[PDB]
Amino acid sequence: SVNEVPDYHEDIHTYLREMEVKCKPKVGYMKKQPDITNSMRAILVDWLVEVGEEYKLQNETLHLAVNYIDRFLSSMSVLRGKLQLVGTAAMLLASKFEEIYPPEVAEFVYITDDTYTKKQVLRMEHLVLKVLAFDLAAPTINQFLTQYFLHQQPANCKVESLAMFLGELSLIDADPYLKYLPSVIAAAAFHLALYTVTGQSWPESLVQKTGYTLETLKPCLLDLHQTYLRAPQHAQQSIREKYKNSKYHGVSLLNPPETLNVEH
């Protein structure tokens, strides 16, 4: 209907595809941050998921904050004891951008266990805005997924939730996921989720839309399959906890497919 925006979805898809390239953080930014690591980032991103659950925020909000963080850290050296302040400011900024009812600032100070002060959060907010030069309308894995869901015949709630879940898992591990674009991560996630539940493939309709085939999506699939397989053993666990709920149909409790199949 009009809610699926038929006169504009093609135009919109092209622009998101064009913008995700310009909002992409630098691939090896962690190699240049002398005080912080990938592991540390994983703690942070996982903690944001917990924040997302407690305050019942939109997943889009989570994906944006992660983009804000990676971009900030792609240009600013941050010490370990300030990583969470950045992260908190990112979540606030993302909330304000995306949420109908963003949590008030005091609520963001609360979840940082009073490690930081209200003023610090407020100052970091402005700092994040400057570094990102107010460019906050970044395309996310979610914005692509939600478009791909329109190509289901018919719609499957287990798939959508599983697609959400996998794409979400990628936010945790900068290695490797920093080197894939949101649209690609979404594409792999969608295939992998669809194949698990129903048993079928990345649809032909979405091949003419994206220009992505499984052969182009191969490297990403393999990495995402790995992560899926390993997920129960991962240090960070909040995404699996989140996706055990009836809300998300418990798709994290499903068994990952042993193999995918694809080569001569």
Binding site: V2, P102, T146
Partner: protein, 268 residues
């Protein structure tokens, strides 16, 4: 920071902040400054600012007001805009007795649709199209302004803020509180504005939400001086059903705009 700029007069107050006419003492350029106070002990940079700035930096079109610069301080945020000489509301009021020439009306609608189509092409709802937020110059251009209430939507849309467009320009799907609303709400608005350019008075000047609804039901069932073409487009811009309602992109291809030009507005 603002040493270069010289305040001339107060322009007024948008959805947020305060707007001034100002001149760059060095270049001679006349600008409009949207001044935004922060808010540092509470509550931060307002989401209206964050959205307008983030979006308007992206959107670069002849029919969308141009954001020139963003100037920071610790306590004040100054948006530097291109100045436009007046708004559609004052122009219509100025043209209450004379009328607005039709080829001008056609032009303004054509441009408003071009600007809006560019918004919709880039996943942006404006959500506050009223004649006060539509700016005209002396060259003949009209532009969409104040993106303070704008939002970057997704495909498909989800539930957005309800308290969203000013009563008189509000689409029925917002009035009746339908969980989803989309690009159609902006079309509805331009529809009411089209009508308003012809008659030089609001089409549905409701006193309340109920009244607003009833006024809509009267007219469309439950604008005299306009040609057959004009009415067709109008009623397609004001379809009850948001799915049936015309898109801006399709509106530009209407026979109504076949002979369109770009006249200079009568009056200063």
């Amino acid at each position: 920071s603002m040493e270069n700029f010289q305040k001339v007069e107060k322009i007024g107050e948008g959805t947020y902040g305060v707007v001034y006419k100002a001149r760059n003492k060095l270049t001679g350029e006349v600008v409009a400054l949207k001044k935004i106070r922060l808010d540092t002990e509470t509550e931060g940079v307002p989401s209206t600012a964050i959205r307008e700035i983030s979006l308007l930096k992206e959107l670069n079109h002849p029919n969308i007001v141009k954001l020139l610069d963003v100037i920071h301080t610790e306590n004040k945020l100054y948006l530097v805009f291109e100045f436009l000489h007046q708004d559609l509301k004052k122009f219509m009021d100025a043209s209450a007795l004379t009328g607005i020439p039709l080829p001008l009306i056609k032009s303004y609608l054509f441009q408003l649709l071009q600007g809006l189509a560019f918004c919709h092409s880039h996943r942006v709802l404006h959500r506050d199209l009223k004649p006060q937020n539509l700016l005209i110059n002396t060259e003949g251009a009209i532009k969409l302004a104040d993106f303070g209430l704008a939002r970057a939507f997704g495909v498909p849309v989800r539930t957005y803020t309800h308290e969203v467009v000013t009563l008189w320009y509000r689409a029925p799907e917002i009035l009746l509180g339908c969980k989803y609303y989309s690009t159609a709400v902006d079309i509805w608005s331009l529809g009411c504005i089209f009508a308003e350019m012809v008659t030089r008075r609001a089409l549905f000047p409701g006193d309340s939400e109920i009244d607003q609804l009833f006024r809509i039901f009267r007219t469309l069932g439950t604008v005299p001086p306009l040609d057959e073409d004009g009415r067709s487009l109008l009623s397609q811009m004001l379809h009850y059903d948001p799915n049936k309602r015309i898109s801006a992109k399709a509106a530009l291809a209407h026979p109504f705009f076949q002979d369109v030009t770009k006249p200079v507005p009568h009056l200063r």
